[PDB]
Ligand binder design. Structure first.
Ligand code: CLA
Ligand code: CLA
Ligand code: CLA
Ligand code: CLA
Ligand code: CLA
Ligand code: CLA
Ligand code: CLA
Ligand code: KC2
Ligand SMILES: CC1=C(C#C/C(C)=C/C=C/C(C)=C/C=C/C=C(C)/C=C/C=C(C)/C=C/[C@@]23O[C@]2(C)C[C@@H](O)CC3(C)C)C(C)(C)C[C@H](O)C1
Ligand SMILES: CC1=C(C#C/C(C)=C/C=C/C(C)=C/C=C/C=C(C)/C=C/C=C(C)/C=C/[C@@]23O[C@]2(C)C[C@@H](O)CC3(C)C)C(C)(C)C[C@H](O)C1
Ligand SMILES: CC1=C(C/C=C(\C)CCC[C@H](C)CCC[C@H](C)CCCC(C)C)C(=O)c2ccccc2C1=O
Lengths: 184, 134, 665, 173, 221
């Protein structure tokens, strides 16, 4: 089960002994029909960093899940503004260059993201453990069962990885084709 | 070795097995019992006496970071071949033989030759052998 | 990590670091020893971990000091400088980010640099550096100053923190493979690549616009646009007289790539001859060994910088800014000499504190052959000058060594640039001109070699005979810095490596003074100057090409260089620009003469005089309980050396700078 | 001992070349069969790549879509991709190669679970083969040497052909 | 091999351990004859190494003694420069080499066991030292291989010069030769970029109609 972060932080820090499980028993290594322990390069053999690896994986998955939808939506709809109009910016891939620099539109996003990351670094480093890796307490809609929680974590990880690859595919295809959503 | 308590079952996180073997090989055998204060083996002993099985199984992120910073990596310690080469060099010099070298531009080249530096009178500085005179 | 142990209680102890200073302030020798051993972290109370802590934190504190100095330079350029006038018209306006007060008539020091600005002409090339970097606005200079101050604060914080972050277990400073790999790949490779990026993205457009004549804000806020196929260095910017900044950026990109490749092949272990250097790797894992090696490396790099900053022009208008190029060369040559003698010193310290390498076991042949080569070099090189003097005085120029008479042609001094015939000019000045070598160059170069070899002799003797010698066999027990071993065995004065440095500094100063004079006179006579009109120009040089005719004699050096060219500095009192330089000339002469006091006298005379003087104080009940003492022998030597070098350097500094300032304005 | 006793180190010019500077074989023993399969695939692809870089000049396939005389190593792939998806002869080749590859799953299981070091790269073809075990080992070393040479040669040929416009056999400007 | 042949085994062939002798010249020779053959081989190899060094040095120009002696620039072709040199210098060279040979063969003759040991290394050298820092066999084999290569090279250079007047001209490009252009320095070069016949096309298409805040990619041009 998942315990409140206050209780979970009681046993937190860089563990030195190793639970003898694949990746310390973390969720996300499960095939469709059986068990799929994917680690060809043996990165999980650094058991002390395994919690950091899971935190980074979940951060990347969530960020790419947002990024893919943010590459899809703008072409269909835009913010009601003159500088966000299709005439000022034809495709999402143009947004970075359009809003970089003195305009500050992307500078504000960078600033707020940096503030959020500065505030979350304490959990990322100090209070990171096998059970609280990627857990910020936003557990609304989280099932109240062990199997349900495990399945939800697996679904998050799988969708995050799918979007992690899909964002690379979509951004590369969009840069290559200069085309609307279908090629991204 | 088995007789050393702190070297038994050192957790992989504190120090890898291969790096531990290399460190022990590099360090003189007599120092394993109680290494000097300023040595990687001393750091390993001090931290293995406090961390590991049957002891503190967790560490703060910063404490672990500092421990990994101040413990040695594998590539920092000398290799078997390097230690053999250094030992042979020192043995030659102490035996009174000189692996011949000639100074070059801001350095010296090794000609691959071993000469007899000490002459017939070992304590005589006049008799040290050189190709130029001897 | 535990910062509760850093308290100001020890600030008032004044000597806590040294155990030998426990009996605080019984004499003034205690004060002098406190100062002398303040930064000798090895002999101070504590442990090796504490030594490493102090070394690293002090390095960071000095980094912060340098950042503060750079930020001050940027601030002076931004707010107290005529950089705007210089940028619009570099030739007419001399660089000046230096202003003096009007306290006691001191406003006379400020000289006309522009219509609206009066100040002191700077010679550091900072204006040219800013122009190359693309800094063309007060806002840009202000933000550079802010960045420098922020870096100062960061480095200060880092030093303060690392004084406690590093514990006795700390060993990151012993990871030589990691240190070297990181420095080679990131600090050098990535640094050079990033600076090439900076040049390409900021400096190239701005510099191209400035060369064209465009000063438009929108433009200020297409590589290889103007550079032809001509080899870099073979064609200088006609409107700027310097290597194309796009070529410089390509250079930095290539250098960064090469450094990254070297680091990667080292990472992959492609280099194979590890054994040839394994002995040095085992021996020289010491603070003083690394300090000596680094000091020598940076000395050599400083000398190469001194030569290249002038011979190869890369900064805009620095070629025609004659005071700037001269001052840069002289400054970096002096730093080269100082850091070389430093390398000798710390080599000696490493030998004293650690086991030396096996080349010390045949030290007698090494130093003997060095002594012979020094004697032969000095004899031949200087006796050619003496022969020229004597024969010319007797009235037999046909018997002297000169181009018209017997000539010593430098056959080996061969070209490698393969430049086209002619010279490069820019607005009434000779930005670049080939230096033609003859008998004078042969003689002066062999004088250079002689002086370098004698300085090296002193340093090497100090290093090799540091542990023991035929005279005294327990020099290792005596230590590093001791005055002598006694009047015995004939007299053992200055047998220590410290005294060997004390003499090598004199010899380095002599070498560098001769080098400075050679560069100054040769450039004035054969390179710098103006021109008077396929077109052929007659070049009027500042010294009128008298180096090749007069430099062949010591009398020629005394007359045509010192006496003749000291007219500016000697007659600088009335002139607002260089009256300070004349006064500094006089004061440096005074200081140099004052150094001879300590260099010639001895401790006992001054101790006895001090006691006789103290008699009167005791008579009148003025009893100083920190009993006055004469300076120790080593301290007297150090004070004499410092004053001697400072006075000589000040005289040369004022003389050359006054000459250049007057001639160019 | 070395690798997993796989062919590829014996029968060299001087007998026992054991080429593994970066210790991948020791670092990932579990991936040795995968490494051998990948090496054989790359070699057998590079051999055919060189032969199909040469032959097209002499001959062209019967279908009326590759008959253009300007289909060099540079423009061939991009031109033959064609419009849309799943419409070009390049796509026909991709589908054929996939059909061929799918048999390896039958041979070594769905997830290459049965891929061992003694069966890595072995597709069961034993036509025109040495009868003796020593002969079979010698032919495997021939194959490995030819494949490594073909990999290096195809890399060099493609790089040179694109860099200097020499898309035909000399591959030299 | 044979007991006589073993006197030099380990210092020949492509690898040191081989004994290349297709003619079987040394099959019937005695140990003294083998040592004399090795002495001849080493003398020829050293003379050939020095000869190639000097040949390239003079073919690059850099022929100062001859220049000063003749008061004129001698032909770069070494075989022509021989004839251009004064008889004074030629006889001086012959006499100096004769004196060197006389001293080396009569005043300081090498030992009968090591006829090639001109400098008398086998009086302070310890060849049979089991230390790692004892690569004298490596040094010897390097000497022999370089000397053999230099022998072949110098014979080829002389033959080619005599036949086609080609002396293996060197393009040192610094002092005797004034290379004005990048093409001169590196063959086939005509500009800052390498002479590659491939026009690197854009990996991605660009917008035909731009937009405010575009910052189109820069061109190295
Ligand atoms: C501090 C100044 C300094 C500098 C600038 C150099 C520079 C050099 N040393 Mg080093 N060296 C130094 C001090 C220094 N040394 C000292 C103090 C010692 C005495 C222990 C040595 C001992 C030493 C040795 C033993 C060797 C060098 C060699 C070299 C060369 C290495 C790079 C090379 O071969 O590239 C070219 C390769 C591509 C280079 C000229 C090597 C060499 O060839 O020297 C002639 C070499 O083997 N040096
Ligand atoms: C390398 C460092 C450096 C150096 C050598 C100098 C040197 C100088 N600065 Mg300063 N300066 C620096 C850094 C430096 N600055 C920095 C980092 C800043 C801010 C970024 C400034 C900001 C600054 C200003 C704003 C001014 C100067 C001025 C001056 C000059 C007169 C100072 C004075 O009257 O002091 C007076 C003496 C003291 C303050 C006593 C110091 C000791 C006690 C205990 C305090 C002098 C040439 C003045 C100038 O040039 O006027 C024409 C001037 O107006 N400087
Ligand atoms: C020469 C420059 C230099 C060098 C070599 C180091 C080296 C080190 N610093 Mg850093 N440090 C520097 C400048 C430098 N510092 C400066 C200027 C500051 C002030 C902002 C700091 C402030 C600082 C802190 C506060 C800490 C370090 C730590 C470290 C360690 C590296 C671990 C890390 O976080 O790496 C990634 C980069 C190591 C002892 C950490 C440490 O020792 O953790 C155990 C640590 O906590 N440093
Ligand atoms: C992209 C290639 C490139 C370019 C454009 C330059 C450009 C430059 N380099 Mg060079 N340099 C390069 C690569 C490059 N470098 C590489 C890969 C290295 C090795 C790390 C160096 C190492 C190097 C050093 C050490 C120095 C230079 C210097 C210079 C400057 C003067 C050179 C000159 O006049 O040569 C004249 C040109 C020739 C003689 C033609 C020969 C060209 C080749 C060999 C053919 C100039 C900015 C000098 C400098 O900065 O002076 C202030 C200098 O001291 N470079
Ligand atoms: C990319 C193709 C490829 C692959 C998958 C392999 C795989 C292998 N080679 Mg290698 N090999 C290659 C190309 C390749 N080779 C080429 C081009 C050559 C010619 C220079 C060789 C020459 C060669 C020799 C001489 C030997 C091997 C051997 C091996 C085996 C052990 C080394 C290892 O673990 O490598 C793993 C390699 C990789 C994961 C590829 C990384 C490539 C870079 C880093 C990207 C392994 C099956 C050894 C063997 O067969 O032992 C029985 C052996 O002795 N190879
Ligand atoms: C294994 C590498 C390889 C690859 C990637 C290709 C790729 C290609 N070949 Mg093929 N080809 C190969 C090996 C290869 N060939 C070999 C070994 C041969 C010798 C029989 C040929 C002989 C060949 C011919 C004769 C022709 C091609 C052609 C083609 C093109 C169409 C493929 C097709 O429709 O196949 C269908 C199945 C394509 C560029 C056509 C083309 O346009 O070439 C430029 C063409 O006419 N190939
Ligand atoms: C002066 C010439 C010379 C001499 C005296 C020797 C002597 C020797 N060599 Mg040989 N060698 C030479 C040149 C010479 N070599 C050259 C240039 C090469 C390079 C191809 C070699 C390569 C070589 C190898 C690889 C080995 C030897 C070995 C030996 C030893 C045993 C074999 C033997 O009987 O050689 C006697 C050789 C001769 C009598 C030379 C005969 C030359 C004939 C007549 C042809 C000459 C024509 C030539 C091409 C010039 C034509 C010019 C014209 C067109 C103008 C022996 C000490 C072996 C050894 O040391 O084993 C331990 C060994 O393994 N040598
Ligand atoms: C550090 C040492 C080293 C270096 C730097 C080096 C460099 C190069 C280069 C690049 C400059 C090339 C292009 C090249 C090529 C080949 N090397 Mg080689 N090689 C080294 C060592 C060995 C050893 C020990 C062996 C070997 C071999 C082969 C074979 C033939 C294989 C065969 O047909 O079996 C080929 C084609 C094996 C052999 O048998 O060579 C006849 C063998 O045993 N190499 N080698
Ligand atoms: C648009 C733009 C910009 C940008 C950008 C950004 C954000 C770019 C992002 C790029 C990104 C995110 C690129 C991901 C690539 C992923 C790859 C290659 C995955 C390969 C995966 C391979 C080869 C294989 C995977 C597997 O084998 C594994 C490991 C195990 C198997 O069981 C399953 C499979 C076979 C699948 C700027 C700079 C911001 C502004 C500028 O103006 C232009
Ligand atoms: C020195 C040394 C060694 C070594 C070595 C080194 C340095 C080896 C380096 C090898 C290297 C660097 C090998 C590159 C290969 C590149 C390839 C295959 C590129 C294919 C590219 C292809 C297939 C591209 C195709 C197309 O783009 C084309 C043409 C047109 C487009 O329309 C369509 C596409 C995109 C499909 C030994 C020998 C290993 C051991 C020895 O001991 C020591
Ligand atoms: C003069 C002299 C002394 C006597 C000098 C002493 C004691 C120095 C006096 C130190 C004073 C008190 C330091 C204070 C600094 C100056 C008074 C500052 C003057 C600044 C002016 C601008 C006013 C020695 O003791 C000595 C020892 C060994 C070799 C040579 C000598 C030597 O030459």
């Amino acid at each position: 089960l998942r315990r409140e972060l206050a209780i979970a932080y009681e046993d937190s820090g860089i563990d030195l002994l190793d639970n003898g499980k694949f990746c310390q028993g973390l969720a996300g290594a499960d095939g469709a029909w059986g068990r799929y322990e994917f680690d060809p390069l043996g990165f999980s053999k650094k058991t002390e960093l395994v919690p950091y690896f899971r935190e980074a994986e979940l951060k990347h998955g969530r960020l790419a899940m947002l990024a893919w939808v943010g590459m899809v939506v703008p072409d269909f709809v835009r913010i009601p503004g003159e500088k966000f109009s299709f005439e000022a910016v034809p495709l999402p891939i143009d947004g970075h260059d359009a809003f970089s620099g003195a305009t500050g539109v992307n500078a504000q996003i960078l600033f707020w993201v940096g503030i959020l990351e500065f505030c979350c670094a304490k959990k990322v480093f100090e209070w990171n453990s096998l059970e609280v890796a990627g857990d910020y307490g936003l557990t609304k809609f989280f099932p109240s069962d062990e199997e349900g929680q495990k399945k939800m974590r697996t679904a998050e990880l799988k969708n995050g990885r799918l979007a992690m690859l899909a964002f690379g595919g979509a951004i590369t295809q969009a840069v290559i084709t200069r085309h609307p959503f279908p090629w991204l | 070795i088995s007789k050393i308590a702190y070297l038994q079952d050192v957790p992989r996180t504190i120090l890898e097995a291969d790096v531990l073997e290399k460190l022990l090989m590099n360090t003189p055998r007599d120092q394993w019992e109680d290494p000097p204060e300023d040595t990687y083996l001393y750091t390993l002993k001090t931290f293995a006496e406090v961390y590991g099985p049957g002891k503190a199984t967790k560490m703060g992120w910063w404490d672990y970071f500092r421990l990994k910073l101040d413990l040695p990596p594998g590539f920092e310690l000398l290799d078997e071949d390097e230690m053999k080469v250094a030992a042979d060099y020192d043995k030659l010099m102490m035996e009174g033989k000189i692996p011949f070298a000639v100074p070059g531009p801001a350095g010296f080249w090794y000609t691959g030759a071993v000469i007899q530096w000490k002459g017939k009178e070992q304590f005589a500085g006049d008799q040290v052998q050189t190709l130029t005179e001897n | 990590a535990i910062f509760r142990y850093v308290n100001a209680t020890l600030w008032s102890k004044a000597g806590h670091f040294n155990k030998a200073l426990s009996k605080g302030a019984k004499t003034t020798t205690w004060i002098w020893n406190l100062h002398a051993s303040a930064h000798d972290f090895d002999i101070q109370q504590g442990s090796a971990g504490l030594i490493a802590r102090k070394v690293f934190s002090s390095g960071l504190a000095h980094l912060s000091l340098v950042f503060f100095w750079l930020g001050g330079m940027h601030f002076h350029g931004a707010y107290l400088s005529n950089y705007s006038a210089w940028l619009k018209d570099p030739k007419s306006v001399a660089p000046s980010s230096h202003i003096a007060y009007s306290l006691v008539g001191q406003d006379i020091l400020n000289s006309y640099t522009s219509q609206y600005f009066s100040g002191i002409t700077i010679t550091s090339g900072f204006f040219q550096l800013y122009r190359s970097e693309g800094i063309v606005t007060q806002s840009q200079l202000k933000y550079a100053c802010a960045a420098s101050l922020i870096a100062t604060l960061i480095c200060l914080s880092g030093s303060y923190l690392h004084m406690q972050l590093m514990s006795k277990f700390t060993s990151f400073y012993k990871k030589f493979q990691s240190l070297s790999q990181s420095h080679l790949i990131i600090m050098f490779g990535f640094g050079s690549v990033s600076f090439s990026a900076h040049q390409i993205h900021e400096a190239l457009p701005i510099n191209s616009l400035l060369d064209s004549g465009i000063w438009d804000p929108q433009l200020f806020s297409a590589i290889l646009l103007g550079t032809p196929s001509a080899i870099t260095g073979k064609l200088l910017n006609p409107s700027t007289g310097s290597i194309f900044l796009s070529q410089v950026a390509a250079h930095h990109l290539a250098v960064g790539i090469v450094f990254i490749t070297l680091g990667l092949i080292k990472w992959c272990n492609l280099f194979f001859s590890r054994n040839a250097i394994l002995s040095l790797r085992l021996a020289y894992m010491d603070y003083h060994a690394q300090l000596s090696i680094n000091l020598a490396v940076w000395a050599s790099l400083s000398m190469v910088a001194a030569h290249h900053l002038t011979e190869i022009p890369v900064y805009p208008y620095e070629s025609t800014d004659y005071p700037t190029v001269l001052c840069l060369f002289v400054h970096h040559a002096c730093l080269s000499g100082f850091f070389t003698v430093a390398s000798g010193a710390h080599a000696s310290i490493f030998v004293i504190r650690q086991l030396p390498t096996s080349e010390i076991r045949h030290r007698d042949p090494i130093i003997g052959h060095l002594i012979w080569v020094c004697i032969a070099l000095g004899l031949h090189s200087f006796g050619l000058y003496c022969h020229n003097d004597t024969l010319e005085a007797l009235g037999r120029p046909e018997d002297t060594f000169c181009d018209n008479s017997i000539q010593l042609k430098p056959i080996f001094a061969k070209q490698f640039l393969g430049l086209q015939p002619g010279i490069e000019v820019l607005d009434g000045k000779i930005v670049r001109m080939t230096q033609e070598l003859g008998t004078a160059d042969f003689m002066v170069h062999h004088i250079h070699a002689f002086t370098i070899h004698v300085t090296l002799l002193i340093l090497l003797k100090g290093v090799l005979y540091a542990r023991n010698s035929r005279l005294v066999s327990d020099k290792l027990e005596l230590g590093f810095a001791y005055p002598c071993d006694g009047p015995g065995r004939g007299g053992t004065c200055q047998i220590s490596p410290w005294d060997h440095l004390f003499l090598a500094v004199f010899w380095m100063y002599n070498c560098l003074s001769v080098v400075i004079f050679h560069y100054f006179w040769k450039m004035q006579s054969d390179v710098w100057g103006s021109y008077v009109h396929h077109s052929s120009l007659t070049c009027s040089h500042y010294s009128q090409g008298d180096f090749s005719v007069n430099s062949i004699t010591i009398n020629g050096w005394l007359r045509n260089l010192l006496w003749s060219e000291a007219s500016q500095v000697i007659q600088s009192y009335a002139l607002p620009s260089i009256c300070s330089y004349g006064f500094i000339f006089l004061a440096a002469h005074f200081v140099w003469a004052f150094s001879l006091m300590f260099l010639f006298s001895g401790r006992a005379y001054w101790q006895e005089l001090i006691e006789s003087i103290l008699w009167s104080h005791h008579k009148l009940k003025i009893v100083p309980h920190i009993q006055p003492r004469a300076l120790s022998i080593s301290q007297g030597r150090a004070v004499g050396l410092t004053h001697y070098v400072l006075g000589g350097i000040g005289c040369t500094w004022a003389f050359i700078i006054s000459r250049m300032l007057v001639l160019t304005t | 001992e070395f690798a997993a006793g796989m062919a590829g180190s014996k029968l060299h010019g001087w007998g026992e070349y054991q080429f593994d500077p970066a210790g991948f074989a020791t670092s990932y023993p579990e991936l040795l069969g995968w490494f051998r399969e990948s090496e054989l695939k790359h070699g057998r692809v590079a051999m055919l790549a060189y032969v199909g870089l040469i032959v097209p000049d002499a001959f062209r396939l019967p279908f009326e879509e590759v008959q253009d005389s300007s289909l060099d190593l540079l423009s061939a792939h991009n031109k033959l991709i064609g419009p849309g998806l799943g419409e070009g002869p390049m796509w026909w080749l991709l589908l054929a190669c996939g059909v061929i590859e799918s048999f390896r799953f039958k041979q070594v299981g769905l997830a290459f679970e049965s891929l061992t070091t003694e069966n890595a790269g072995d597709l069961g073809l034993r036509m025109f083969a040495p009868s003796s075990a020593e002969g079979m080992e010698s032919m495997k070393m021939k194959e490995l040497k030819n494949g490594r040479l073909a990999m290096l040669a195809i890399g060099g040929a493609l790089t040179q052909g694109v860099l200097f416009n020499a898309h035909h056999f000399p591959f030299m400007s | 091999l044979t007991p006589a042949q073993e006197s030099i085994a380990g210092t020949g062939g492509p690898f040191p351990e081989n004994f290349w002798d297709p003619a079987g010249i040394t099959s019937k020779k005695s140990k003294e004859e083998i040592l004399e053959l090795r002495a001849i081989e080493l003398k020829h190899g050293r003379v050939a190494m020095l000869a190639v060094l000097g040949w390239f040095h003079v073919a690059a120009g850099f022929h100062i003694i001859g220049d000063l002696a003749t008061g004129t620039y001698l032909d770069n072709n070494p075989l022509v420069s021989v004839t251009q040199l004064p008889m004074g210098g030629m006889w001086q060279t012959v006499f100096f080499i004769m004196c060197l040979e006389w001293v080396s063969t009569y005043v300081c003759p090498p030992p009968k066991s090591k006829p090639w040991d001109i400098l008398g290394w086998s009086d302070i050298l310890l060849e049979d030292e089991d230390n790692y820092w004892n690569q004298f066999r490596k040094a010897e084999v390097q000497e022999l291989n370089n000397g053999r290569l230099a022998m072949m090279a110098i014979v080829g250079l002389i033959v080619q010069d005599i036949f086609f007047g080609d002396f293996g001209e060197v393009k040192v490009c610094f002092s005797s030769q004034t290379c004005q252009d990048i093409g001169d320095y590196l063959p086939g070069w005509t500009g800052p970029l390498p002479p590659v016949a491939y026009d690197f096309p854009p990996l991605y298409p660009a917008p035909e109609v731009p937009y405010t805040g575009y910052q189109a990619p820069l061109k190295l041009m």
